[PDB]
Coordinates of C-alpha atoms and ligand atoms in Angstrom, one line a residue:
Chain D
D665 CA -18.9 40.7 7.1
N666 CA -17.4 37.3 8.1
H667 CA -20.2 34.9 7.0
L668 CA -19.2 33.5 3.7
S669 CA -20.9 31.7 0.8
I670 CA -18.6 28.9 -0.3
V671 CA -19.0 26.6 -3.4
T672 CA -17.5 23.2 -3.6
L673 CA -17.7 20.1 -5.9
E674 CA -17.8 16.4 -5.2
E675 CA -14.6 14.5 -6.1
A676 CA -13.4 11.9 -3.6
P677 CA -11.1 12.0 -1.8
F678 CA -11.0 15.8 -1.8
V679 CA -14.8 16.2 -1.4
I680 CA -17.1 13.3 -0.5
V681 CA -20.8 13.8 -0.3
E682 CA -23.3 11.9 1.8
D683 CA -27.0 12.1 2.4
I684 CA -28.1 13.5 5.7
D685 CA -28.4 11.1 8.7
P686 CA -32.1 10.1 8.8
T687 CA -32.6 13.0 12.3
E688 CA -31.5 15.5 9.6
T689 CA -28.1 16.2 11.1
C690 CA -24.6 16.0 9.6
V691 CA -22.5 14.1 12.2
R692 CA -18.7 13.5 12.3
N693 CA -16.1 15.1 10.0
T694 CA -19.0 16.0 7.7
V695 CA -20.2 19.6 7.4
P696 CA -23.6 20.6 6.0
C697 CA -23.7 21.4 2.3
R698 CA -26.7 22.1 0.2
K699 CA -27.3 21.2 -3.4
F700 CA -29.9 22.7 -5.7
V701 CA -31.4 19.7 -7.5
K702 CA -33.5 20.1 -10.6
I703 CA -37.1 19.1 -11.0
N704 CA -36.6 17.8 -14.6
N705 CA -34.3 18.7 -17.5
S706 CA -36.7 21.2 -19.2
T707 CA -37.2 23.6 -16.3
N708 CA -35.1 25.8 -14.1
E709 CA -37.1 24.8 -11.0
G710 CA -35.4 22.7 -8.3
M711 CA -35.2 22.2 -4.5
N712 CA -32.2 22.8 -2.2
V713 CA -31.3 19.4 -1.0
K714 CA -29.4 18.9 2.2
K715 CA -26.2 16.7 2.2
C716 CA -23.1 16.3 4.2
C717 CA -19.6 16.9 2.9
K718 CA -16.3 15.5 4.0
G719 CA -12.8 15.0 2.8
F720 CA -9.3 16.4 2.4
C721 CA -10.4 19.9 1.3
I722 CA -13.4 20.0 3.7
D723 CA -10.9 19.4 6.5
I724 CA -8.9 22.3 5.0
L725 CA -12.0 24.4 5.0
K726 CA -12.5 23.7 8.7
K727 CA -9.0 24.7 9.7
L728 CA -9.3 27.9 7.7
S729 CA -12.7 28.7 9.4
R730 CA -11.0 28.4 12.8
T731 CA -7.7 30.1 11.9
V732 CA -9.1 32.9 9.7
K733 CA -12.3 33.2 11.8
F734 CA -15.2 33.1 9.4
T735 CA -18.4 31.1 9.2
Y736 CA -19.8 29.7 5.9
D737 CA -22.7 28.2 4.0
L738 CA -21.3 25.5 1.8
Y739 CA -23.1 24.5 -1.4
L740 CA -22.2 22.2 -4.3
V741 CA -22.0 23.4 -7.9
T742 CA -24.9 22.2 -10.1
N743 CA -23.8 23.5 -13.5
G744 CA -20.4 22.4 -14.6
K745 CA -17.4 21.0 -12.8
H746 CA -14.3 23.0 -11.8
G747 CA -14.9 25.9 -14.2
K748 CA -14.7 26.2 -18.0
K749 CA -15.1 29.4 -20.0
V750 CA -17.9 28.5 -22.4
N751 CA -18.4 31.4 -24.9
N752 CA -16.8 33.5 -22.3
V753 CA -19.4 32.6 -19.6
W754 CA -17.7 30.5 -16.9
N755 CA -19.6 27.6 -15.4
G756 CA -18.3 25.4 -12.6
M757 CA -16.9 26.6 -9.3
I758 CA -15.0 29.4 -11.1
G759 CA -18.2 30.8 -12.5
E760 CA -19.9 30.8 -9.1
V761 CA -17.1 33.1 -8.0
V762 CA -16.6 35.3 -11.0
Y763 CA -20.3 36.2 -10.9
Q764 CA -20.2 36.7 -7.2
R765 CA -22.5 33.8 -6.1
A766 CA -19.6 32.5 -3.9
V767 CA -16.8 34.4 -2.4
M768 CA -14.5 31.5 -2.3
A769 CA -14.5 28.0 -3.9
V770 CA -13.0 25.1 -2.0
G771 CA -12.2 21.9 -3.8
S772 CA -9.8 20.0 -6.0
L773 CA -9.6 23.1 -8.2
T774 CA -6.4 23.4 -10.3
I775 CA -4.6 26.8 -10.5
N776 CA -4.2 27.8 -14.1
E777 CA -3.3 31.0 -15.9
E778 CA -6.8 31.4 -17.5
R779 CA -8.6 31.2 -14.1
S780 CA -6.1 33.5 -12.4
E781 CA -7.0 36.4 -14.7
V782 CA -10.6 36.3 -13.4
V783 CA -10.2 34.9 -9.8
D784 CA -7.5 35.1 -7.2
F785 CA -5.9 31.8 -6.1
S786 CA -4.5 31.1 -2.6
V787 CA -1.1 29.5 -2.3
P788 CA -1.4 25.9 -3.6
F789 CA -2.1 23.4 -0.9
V790 CA -1.5 20.1 -2.8
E791 CA 0.8 19.6 -5.7
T792 CA -0.8 18.3 -8.9
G793 CA 0.1 18.5 -12.6
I794 CA -0.4 16.4 -15.7
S795 CA 0.8 12.9 -15.1
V796 CA 0.9 9.3 -16.6
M797 CA -0.5 6.1 -15.0
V798 CA 0.8 2.8 -16.3
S799 CA 0.8 -0.8 -15.3
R800 CA 4.0 -1.6 -13.4
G801 CA 6.7 -2.5 -15.9
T802 CA 5.9 0.0 -18.7
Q803 CA 8.8 2.4 -19.1
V804 CA 7.6 6.0 -19.6
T805 CA 9.2 9.3 -18.7
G806 CA 6.2 11.6 -18.7
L807 CA 3.9 13.5 -20.9
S808 CA 6.7 14.9 -23.1
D809 CA 7.8 11.3 -23.7
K810 CA 8.7 10.6 -27.3
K811 CA 6.4 7.5 -27.1
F812 CA 3.6 10.1 -26.7
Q813 CA 4.6 13.0 -29.0
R814 CA 5.3 10.7 -32.0
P815 CA 3.3 7.5 -31.3
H816 CA 3.9 5.7 -34.6
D817 CA 7.7 5.8 -34.1
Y818 CA 7.3 2.7 -32.0
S819 CA 5.8 -0.7 -33.0
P820 CA 3.5 -1.6 -31.6
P821 CA 2.3 2.0 -31.2
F822 CA 1.4 2.8 -27.6
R823 CA -2.3 3.0 -26.7
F824 CA -2.9 5.9 -24.3
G825 CA -5.6 8.5 -23.7
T826 CA -7.3 10.8 -21.2
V827 CA -10.8 11.8 -20.3
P828 CA -11.8 14.5 -22.9
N829 CA -13.2 18.0 -22.3
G830 CA -11.1 18.7 -19.3
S831 CA -7.8 20.6 -18.7
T832 CA -5.6 17.6 -19.6
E833 CA -7.2 17.5 -23.1
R834 CA -6.9 21.2 -23.6
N835 CA -3.3 21.5 -22.4
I836 CA -2.3 18.6 -24.7
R837 CA -4.2 20.0 -27.7
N838 CA -2.2 23.3 -27.4
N839 CA 1.3 21.8 -26.6
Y840 CA 1.3 18.5 -28.6
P841 CA -1.0 18.8 -31.6
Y842 CA -0.2 15.5 -33.0
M843 CA -0.3 13.7 -29.7
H844 CA -3.8 15.1 -29.2
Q845 CA -5.0 13.8 -32.6
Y846 CA -3.7 10.3 -32.0
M847 CA -4.9 9.7 -28.5
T848 CA -8.5 10.8 -29.4
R849 CA -9.5 7.3 -30.4
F850 CA -8.5 6.3 -26.9
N851 CA -10.7 8.8 -24.9
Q852 CA -12.0 7.4 -21.6
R853 CA -15.3 7.9 -19.8
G854 CA -13.7 8.7 -16.5
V855 CA -11.0 7.7 -14.1
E856 CA -12.5 4.5 -12.7
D857 CA -13.4 3.8 -16.3
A858 CA -9.8 4.1 -17.5
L859 CA -8.2 2.3 -14.6
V860 CA -10.0 -0.9 -15.7
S861 CA -8.8 -0.5 -19.2
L862 CA -5.3 -0.2 -17.9
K863 CA -5.7 -3.3 -15.8
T864 CA -7.2 -5.5 -18.5
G865 CA -4.5 -4.6 -21.0
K866 CA -6.8 -2.5 -23.3
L867 CA -4.9 0.8 -22.6
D868 CA -1.2 1.2 -22.2
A869 CA -1.2 4.6 -20.4
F870 CA -3.5 7.1 -18.8
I871 CA -2.7 10.8 -18.8
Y872 CA -4.6 12.8 -16.1
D873 CA -4.5 15.1 -13.0
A874 CA -1.5 14.0 -10.9
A875 CA -3.0 14.1 -7.4
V876 CA -5.9 12.0 -8.7
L877 CA -3.6 9.4 -10.3
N878 CA -1.4 9.3 -7.2
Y879 CA -4.5 8.7 -5.0
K880 CA -5.7 5.9 -7.3
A881 CA -2.3 4.3 -7.3
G882 CA -2.1 4.3 -3.5
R883 CA -5.3 2.4 -3.1
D884 CA -5.0 0.0 -6.1
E885 CA -5.6 -3.6 -5.1
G886 CA -2.5 -5.6 -5.7
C887 CA -0.6 -2.4 -6.2
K888 CA 0.0 -2.9 -9.9
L889 CA -1.1 0.5 -11.3
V890 CA 1.6 3.1 -10.9
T891 CA 2.3 6.8 -11.9
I892 CA 5.6 8.3 -13.1
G893 CA 8.0 10.0 -10.7
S894 CA 6.9 13.4 -9.4
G895 CA 9.9 14.9 -11.3
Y896 CA 8.4 14.1 -14.7
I897 CA 5.0 15.8 -14.1
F898 CA 4.0 18.3 -16.7
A899 CA 2.5 21.8 -16.0
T900 CA 3.1 21.3 -12.3
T901 CA 0.7 23.4 -10.2
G902 CA -1.7 22.7 -7.4
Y903 CA -5.1 22.8 -5.9
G904 CA -6.0 26.2 -4.4
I905 CA -8.9 28.2 -2.9
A906 CA -10.4 30.5 -5.5
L907 CA -11.6 33.8 -4.1
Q908 CA -12.9 37.0 -5.9
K909 CA -10.5 39.3 -7.6
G910 CA -9.3 41.7 -4.9
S911 CA -10.6 39.5 -2.1
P912 CA -9.5 40.8 1.3
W913 CA -9.5 37.2 2.6
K914 CA -6.6 36.0 0.3
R915 CA -4.0 37.4 2.7
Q916 CA -5.1 35.6 5.9
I917 CA -5.9 32.5 3.8
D918 CA -2.4 32.3 2.3
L919 CA -0.7 32.8 5.7
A920 CA -3.0 30.2 7.2
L921 CA -2.3 27.7 4.4
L922 CA 1.5 28.1 4.6
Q923 CA 1.2 27.7 8.3
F924 CA -0.5 24.4 7.9
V925 CA 2.2 23.1 5.5
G926 CA 4.8 24.4 7.9
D927 CA 3.7 22.9 11.3
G928 CA 2.8 19.5 9.9
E929 CA -1.0 19.9 9.9
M930 CA -1.1 19.4 6.1
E931 CA 1.0 16.2 5.9
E932 CA -1.3 14.8 8.6
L933 CA -4.4 15.5 6.4
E934 CA -2.5 14.0 3.5
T935 CA -1.8 10.8 5.4
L936 CA -5.4 10.8 6.7
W937 CA -7.1 11.2 3.3
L938 CA -4.6 10.7 0.6
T939 CA -1.9 8.2 1.5
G940 CA -2.8 4.6 0.6
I941 CA -1.5 1.1 0.9
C942 CA 0.8 1.0 -2.1
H943 CA 4.4 2.2 -1.5
Chain L
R918 CA 14.9 49.3 -14.4
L919 CA 14.5 46.5 -11.8
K920 CA 17.3 45.6 -9.4
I921 CA 17.4 41.8 -9.3
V922 CA 19.3 40.1 -6.5
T923 CA 20.1 36.4 -6.5
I924 CA 22.6 33.9 -5.0
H925 CA 25.0 31.3 -6.2
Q926 CA 23.1 28.0 -6.2
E927 CA 23.7 25.3 -8.8
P928 CA 22.0 24.3 -10.8
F929 CA 19.9 27.5 -10.7
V930 CA 22.6 30.1 -10.8
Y931 CA 26.1 29.3 -11.9
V932 CA 28.4 32.3 -11.2
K933 CA 31.5 32.3 -13.5
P934 CA 34.4 34.7 -14.2
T935 CA 34.3 37.2 -16.9
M936 CA 36.4 37.1 -20.0
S937 CA 39.1 39.7 -20.5
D938 CA 37.1 42.2 -22.5
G939 CA 34.4 42.0 -19.9
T940 CA 32.2 39.7 -22.0
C941 CA 30.8 36.3 -21.1
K942 CA 32.0 33.2 -22.9
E943 CA 29.4 32.2 -25.6
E944 CA 28.0 28.7 -24.9
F945 CA 25.5 26.2 -26.2
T946 CA 24.0 23.1 -24.7
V947 CA 24.8 19.6 -25.9
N948 CA 21.3 19.8 -27.4
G949 CA 22.4 22.8 -29.5
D950 CA 20.6 25.5 -27.7
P951 CA 22.2 28.8 -26.7
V952 CA 23.3 29.3 -23.1
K953 CA 22.0 32.7 -22.2
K954 CA 24.4 34.6 -19.8
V955 CA 23.8 37.9 -17.9
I956 CA 26.4 40.0 -16.2
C957 CA 25.9 40.0 -12.4
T958 CA 28.0 42.0 -9.9
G959 CA 29.1 40.7 -6.6
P960 CA 31.6 39.9 -3.8
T961 CA 32.7 43.7 -6.1
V962 CA 33.6 42.4 -9.6
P963 CA 31.0 41.8 -12.3
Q964 CA 30.7 38.2 -13.2
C965 CA 28.7 35.9 -15.5
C966 CA 25.4 34.4 -14.4
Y967 CA 23.4 31.7 -15.9
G968 CA 21.2 28.7 -15.1
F969 CA 17.6 27.9 -14.5
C970 CA 16.6 31.1 -12.7
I971 CA 18.6 33.1 -15.2
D972 CA 16.6 31.9 -18.2
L973 CA 13.5 32.4 -16.1
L974 CA 14.5 36.0 -15.4
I975 CA 15.0 36.5 -19.2
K976 CA 11.5 35.1 -19.9
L977 CA 10.0 37.4 -17.3
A978 CA 12.0 40.3 -18.5
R979 CA 10.7 39.7 -22.0
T980 CA 7.2 38.7 -21.1
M981 CA 6.6 41.8 -19.0
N982 CA 9.0 44.0 -20.9
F983 CA 11.4 45.4 -18.3
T984 CA 15.1 45.9 -18.1
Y985 CA 17.3 44.9 -15.2
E986 CA 20.6 44.7 -13.4
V987 CA 21.5 41.6 -11.5
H988 CA 23.7 41.3 -8.4
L989 CA 24.6 38.6 -5.9
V990 CA 23.4 39.1 -2.4
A991 CA 25.8 41.0 -0.1
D992 CA 26.0 38.4 2.7
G993 CA 25.5 35.4 0.5
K994 CA 22.5 34.3 2.5
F995 CA 18.9 33.5 1.7
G996 CA 17.5 35.3 4.7
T997 CA 16.1 34.8 8.1
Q998 CA 14.7 37.2 10.7
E999 CA 17.1 38.2 13.5
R1000 CA 16.8 40.5 16.5
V1001 CA 18.7 43.7 17.0
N1002 CA 13.9 45.6 20.2
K1003 CA 13.5 45.7 16.4
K1004 CA 13.9 42.8 14.1
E1005 CA 15.5 42.6 10.7
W1006 CA 16.1 40.1 7.9
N1007 CA 19.5 39.0 6.5
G1008 CA 20.4 37.8 3.0
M1009 CA 18.2 38.3 -0.1
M1010 CA 15.2 39.0 2.2
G1011 CA 16.7 41.9 4.0
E1012 CA 17.9 43.4 0.7
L1013 CA 14.4 43.0 -0.9
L1014 CA 12.8 44.9 2.0
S1015 CA 15.6 47.5 2.2
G1016 CA 15.2 48.4 -1.4
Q1017 CA 18.6 47.1 -2.5
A1018 CA 16.6 44.6 -4.7
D1019 CA 13.3 45.1 -6.6
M1020 CA 12.8 41.4 -7.0
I1021 CA 14.4 38.1 -5.9
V1022 CA 15.1 35.6 -8.6
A1023 CA 16.4 32.5 -7.0
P1024 CA 15.5 29.2 -5.3
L1025 CA 13.7 31.2 -2.7
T1026 CA 11.6 28.8 -0.5
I1027 CA 8.1 30.0 0.2
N1028 CA 7.1 29.9 3.8
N1029 CA 4.7 31.6 6.1
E1030 CA 7.5 33.5 7.8
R1031 CA 8.8 35.3 4.7
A1032 CA 5.3 35.6 3.2
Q1033 CA 4.2 37.8 6.1
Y1034 CA 6.5 40.6 4.9
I1035 CA 6.9 40.0 1.1
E1036 CA 4.8 38.8 -1.8
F1037 CA 5.6 35.5 -3.6
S1038 CA 4.7 34.5 -7.0
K1039 CA 3.0 31.2 -7.5
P1040 CA 5.7 28.6 -7.3
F1041 CA 7.9 28.2 -10.3
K1042 CA 9.5 25.0 -9.0
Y1043 CA 8.0 22.2 -6.8
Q1044 CA 10.5 20.4 -4.6
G1045 CA 11.2 19.4 -1.1
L1046 CA 13.9 18.6 1.5
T1047 CA 16.2 15.6 1.4
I1048 CA 19.5 14.4 2.9
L1049 CA 22.8 14.2 1.1
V1050 CA 25.4 11.8 2.2
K1051 CA 28.8 10.6 0.9
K1052 CA 28.3 7.2 -0.8
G1053 CA 29.4 4.6 1.7
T1054 CA 27.6 6.3 4.5
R1055 CA 24.2 4.6 4.8
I1056 CA 21.4 6.2 6.9
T1057 CA 17.7 5.3 6.6
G1058 CA 16.6 8.9 6.2
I1059 CA 15.1 11.5 8.4
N1060 CA 14.3 9.2 11.3
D1061 CA 17.6 7.3 11.4
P1062 CA 18.9 6.7 14.9
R1063 CA 22.3 8.4 14.4
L1064 CA 20.2 11.5 13.3
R1065 CA 17.2 11.6 15.8
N1066 CA 19.9 11.1 18.5
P1067 CA 22.6 13.8 18.2
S1068 CA 26.3 13.3 19.1
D1069 CA 29.5 14.6 17.6
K1070 CA 30.4 11.2 16.2
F1071 CA 28.1 11.8 13.2
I1072 CA 27.8 15.4 12.3
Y1073 CA 24.9 16.7 10.1
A1074 CA 23.9 20.3 9.3
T1075 CA 22.1 22.6 6.9
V1076 CA 22.8 26.1 5.6
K1077 CA 23.1 29.2 7.9
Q1078 CA 20.1 31.6 7.7
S1079 CA 17.9 29.6 5.2
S1080 CA 14.4 28.2 5.1
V1081 CA 15.8 24.9 6.4
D1082 CA 17.2 26.6 9.4
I1083 CA 13.9 28.3 10.0
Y1084 CA 12.1 25.0 9.5
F1085 CA 14.2 23.2 12.1
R1086 CA 13.9 26.1 14.5
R1087 CA 10.2 26.9 14.4
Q1088 CA 9.1 23.4 15.5
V1089 CA 9.5 22.3 19.1
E1090 CA 9.8 18.7 18.2
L1091 CA 12.8 19.3 16.0
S1092 CA 14.7 20.9 18.9
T1093 CA 17.3 18.2 19.4
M1094 CA 18.3 18.0 15.8
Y1095 CA 18.3 21.8 15.6
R1096 CA 20.5 22.0 18.7
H1097 CA 22.9 19.7 17.1
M1098 CA 22.8 21.5 13.8
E1099 CA 23.2 25.2 14.8
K1100 CA 26.6 24.1 16.0
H1101 CA 27.5 22.9 12.6
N1102 CA 25.6 24.8 9.8
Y1103 CA 27.5 26.1 6.9
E1104 CA 27.5 29.5 5.2
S1105 CA 26.7 28.1 1.8
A1106 CA 25.6 24.9 0.1
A1107 CA 28.8 24.6 -2.0
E1108 CA 30.8 24.6 1.2
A1109 CA 28.4 22.2 2.9
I1110 CA 28.4 19.9 -0.1
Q1111 CA 32.2 20.1 -0.5
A1112 CA 32.4 19.0 3.2
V1113 CA 30.5 15.8 2.5
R1114 CA 33.1 15.0 -0.1
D1115 CA 35.8 15.8 2.4
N1116 CA 34.2 13.6 5.1
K1117 CA 34.1 16.6 7.4
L1118 CA 30.3 16.6 7.1
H1119 CA 28.2 13.5 7.0
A1120 CA 24.6 14.5 6.3
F1121 CA 23.4 17.6 4.5
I1122 CA 19.8 18.6 4.9
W1123 CA 19.0 20.8 1.9
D1124 CA 16.7 21.4 -1.1
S1125 CA 16.1 18.3 -3.1
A1126 CA 16.1 20.2 -6.4
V1127 CA 19.7 20.9 -5.5
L1128 CA 20.8 17.8 -3.7
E1129 CA 19.3 15.4 -6.3
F1130 CA 21.2 17.3 -9.0
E1131 CA 24.4 17.0 -7.0
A1132 CA 24.1 13.3 -6.8
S1133 CA 23.7 13.0 -10.6
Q1134 CA 26.9 14.9 -11.3
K1135 CA 29.2 14.3 -8.3
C1136 CA 28.8 10.5 -8.1
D1137 CA 30.7 10.2 -4.9
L1138 CA 27.6 11.6 -3.2
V1139 CA 24.0 10.4 -3.1
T1140 CA 20.8 11.4 -1.3
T1141 CA 18.2 9.4 0.6
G1142 CA 15.4 9.7 -1.9
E1143 CA 12.7 10.1 0.7
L1144 CA 11.3 13.6 0.8
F1145 CA 10.4 14.4 4.4
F1146 CA 9.0 17.8 3.6
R1147 CA 7.9 19.5 0.4
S1148 CA 8.2 23.2 -0.5
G1149 CA 8.2 25.6 -3.4
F1150 CA 10.4 28.3 -4.9
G1151 CA 8.8 31.6 -5.7
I1152 CA 9.8 35.0 -7.0
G1153 CA 9.9 37.5 -4.2
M1154 CA 8.7 41.1 -4.5
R1155 CA 7.8 43.8 -2.1
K1156 CA 4.3 44.1 -0.8
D1157 CA 2.1 45.5 -3.6
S1158 CA 4.6 45.7 -6.3
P1159 CA 3.1 46.6 -9.7
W1160 CA 4.6 43.3 -10.9
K1161 CA 3.3 40.6 -8.5
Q1162 CA 0.3 39.5 -10.5
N1163 CA 1.7 39.7 -14.0
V1164 CA 4.8 37.9 -12.7
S1165 CA 2.9 34.9 -11.4
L1166 CA 0.6 34.9 -14.4
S1167 CA 3.8 34.5 -16.3
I1168 CA 4.8 31.6 -14.1
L1169 CA 1.5 29.8 -14.7
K1170 CA 1.8 30.3 -18.4
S1171 CA 5.3 28.9 -18.5
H1172 CA 4.3 25.8 -16.6
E1173 CA 1.4 25.0 -19.0
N1174 CA 3.6 26.1 -22.1
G1175 CA 6.2 23.5 -21.2
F1176 CA 8.7 26.3 -20.8
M1177 CA 9.5 25.2 -17.2
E1178 CA 9.8 21.6 -18.6
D1179 CA 12.5 22.7 -21.1
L1180 CA 14.3 24.4 -18.2
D1181 CA 14.2 21.1 -16.3
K1182 CA 15.7 19.3 -19.3
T1183 CA 18.3 22.0 -19.6
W1184 CA 19.3 22.5 -15.9
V1185 CA 17.8 20.1 -13.4
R1186 CA 17.2 16.7 -15.1
Ligands
5E0_50 N1 -8.6 19.9 -11.1 C1 -9.1 19.9 -12.4 C2 -8.0 19.7 -13.4 C3 -7.8 18.3 -13.6 C4 -8.9 17.6 -14.5 C5 -8.4 17.7 -15.7 C6 -9.1 16.9 -16.9 O1 -10.2 16.4 -16.7 O2 -8.5 16.8 -18.0 N2 -7.0 17.5 -15.6 N3 -6.6 18.2 -14.6 C7 -5.3 18.9 -14.4 C8 -4.7 19.5 -15.6 C9 -3.4 20.2 -15.4 C10 -2.8 20.3 -14.1 C11 -3.4 19.7 -12.9 C12 -4.7 19.0 -13.0 C13 -9.7 21.2 -12.8 O3 -9.8 22.2 -12.0 O4 -10.0 21.3 -14.0

């Protein structure tokens, strides 16, 4: 069969969600996408709500639907974000795949070792990694900067942090145990939350997904928040489409993606959705 | 016992003579870490091989527990597809599909072309293409007049039978540049680079992981800085090799471990 259940997850600019045109039709570069929305927090009952979905990865999904020739029913993930193995039961987009509720997941989904053991990932279609955002003028190499691994070796000690309970926190917890302990008192609510702490001099550095920090830096008013050079990014990797283990679609999807980076169609999407006004 | 092929390409593979008794010269880094060296046969004396890929081959050999023999690619090329009618691949690619190599460990660029016939691991290095010029020569980058307009007063080329030659040949809009280049391409990056130091070549279009490293050592040279295209290096294996999935699992692990990071501090940065 070539009709496919695809899960995604809102995260501008990669996936951007809008209510339906009131009319009930998703016009423009938006595609239909349903979302199962709960009735209250103490029942499993809900309704499937209709929304419209656009963005960098949605444009990807379009080209793949045309090149690889499938159709799809896109929905958004209600329980979890990208996918975390909680007591060995994945949630997120990964979990919708592993438990065969979707056959592929399209989104800002990072490719990591743990996920690859249970899903198959297409070739990466955008570079990401773990990166550092600072206010222009702060001198920082990258995550493995000594000003991060031994913070009290500098006076004043740097104030940096990340948004906990993600992959950045976990990766750091394993690789830099004492960096994890110290930056805990500097955990942030989210990205827009931590940008302001950067700009008001509360925080010295922000360690997070590199595509997301680049996109923020591009569209930062005054162009004063900046990320480190791409060469100092830690655990470099990328966003990819998750499929099922053994998926017969991975081959045509890989070829299709590498074709889009080859013939320029990917750089165009990047410039369309990702490239901003700074630099 | 896997037959690994590879290719001279600093800083990923240094290829250095053997000592008298057939051993490799023991070496450490200025950080006090041992410089692993493996014997690699090629154009047909055995030699000493080391660098970024080489450490990476050793991690893979240990992680997945295999033994190996390394050799340098017969024709010294990366590999493009040529007509004979049948078609065939040259360089490391042709050897991988002929069975002369069980796995390519090298700065092999991942592209749709190659990926049609072989399997790639997930990328072990993220990089792109840039331009290398002799300092003194000052072009604005990929869209510089003296580059978009071709003429034998300012000669620029890439490397024969490589992903960059493919890239400039697949795209109808790059036709003029490519028509200029195929009259000038070099058989190897060391030659092409040594030309820019001899003024014989003016702009080298090559892999930034390599060109950026040559600027930081050979200070008579420099690149543009602008990355006009981005690409990744993968391990190459035959279609359905037992190894493909554990190989790339091992590449992801080494990224998150900081192992790749330590290779960058050893070889690239
Ligand atoms: N795409 C997200 C991953 C993203 C969120 C987290 C976090 O919230 O900490 N950081 N990253 C990231 C960690 C390493 C490499 C690249 C990205 C995902 O799929 O989890």
